């Protein structure tokens, strides 16, 4: 496939493009049901 590794900063647009949503709440797991 490839032959090189590009690297640079990422615009907020790029970062948001990588995303699959916007996490809001710190809580991880329900304990009464895992």
């Amino acid at each position: 496939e490839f032959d090189a590794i590009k690297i640079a900063l990422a615009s907020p647009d790029m970062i948001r493009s990588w995303s699959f949503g916007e996490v809001k709440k710190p809580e991880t797991i329900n304990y009464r049901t895992f």
Binding site: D13, M14, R16, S17, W18, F20, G21, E22, K24
Partner: protein, 267 residues
């Protein structure tokens, strides 16, 4: 669950799409009523607009609404705006070509918050809400996987209302056609953007777009993993009507390709 404003908007869009589809089978009643340089506004557009506005007023008698026809109907709570195109590609409808969609987007504090577009003919409903993503009748939308210009399909609209830049545009077109695979020209910027969100086109660009047309698609492609920009990477697009969008790498390639051919009028 679901986002509330999104829900009320999709109800509005369903009603509007059903009205448009119901009128689509009687071309003897909908006439051609032109407004500017080949931007028809038929009575069916007015009826769909009124239906949407009525359906909204039930749940937000205070939200300021924007519409290409009625300008800007102020509301007692003008921090949130409702941008509408009851019909996109009026020409495609008057020719009874079955490819058009209604677009409803809701901005909060200026930043677009939710958007929906609805094609009644194929019965496709592109929904999108920031922080949750974009859906096509229940499927996630991650745009095209393209990472170059080869084999890439480019959807576009032509400045057939700002024909002064025609040459310029055509110029760049030629340049593009030297690297891309094939073009697409459907006639409804909202649906083209939607297709970008669905990866059905590897990218998109256009000149001379009204601020009330991409507002329902720019968030769509954004939460669809793609990105938008002006013809130079800035953000004056919201005023220039010059959009270029697609998955990030393709957008980068397109911008680096177009920056030279660009007439400095759009810059």
């Amino acid at each position: 669950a679901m986002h509330p404003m999104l829900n009320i908007a999709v109800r509005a869009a369903r009603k509007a799409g059903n009205l448009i589809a119901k009128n689509y089978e009687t071309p003897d009643a909908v006439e051609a009523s032109q407004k500017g340089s080949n931007d028809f506004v038929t009575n069916v557009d007015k009826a769909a607009e009124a239906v949407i506005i009525d359906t909204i007023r039930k749940s937000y008698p205070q939200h300021t609404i924007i519409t290409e026809e009625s300008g800007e109907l102020e509301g007692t709570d003008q921090d949130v705006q409702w941008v509408i195109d009851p019909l996109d590609g009026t020409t495609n409808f008057i020719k009874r070509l079955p490819h058009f969609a209604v677009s409803i987007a809701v901005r909060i504090k200026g930043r677009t918050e939710v958007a929906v577009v609805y094609d009644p003919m194929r019965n496709e409903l592109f929904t999108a809400t920031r922080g949750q993503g974009a859906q096509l009748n229940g499927y996630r939308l991650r745009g095209s996987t393209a990472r170059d210009l080869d084999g890439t399909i480019l959807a576009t609209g032509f400045p057939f209302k700002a024909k002064q830049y025609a040459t310029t545009y055509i110029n760049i077109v030629g340049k593009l056609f030297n690297e891309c695979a094939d073009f697409r020209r459907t006639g409804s910027a909202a649906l083209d953007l939607a297709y970008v969100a669905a990866g059905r086109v590897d990218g998109f660009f256009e000149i001379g777009l009204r601020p009330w047309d991409f507002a329902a698609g720019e968030l769509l492609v954004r939460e669809a993993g793609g990105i938008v920009s002006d013809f130079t990477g800035g953000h004056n697009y919201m005023l220039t009507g010059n959009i270029v969008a697609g998955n990030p790498r393709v957008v980068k390639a397109m911008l680096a390709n177009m920056r030279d051919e660009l007439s400095d009028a759009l810059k």
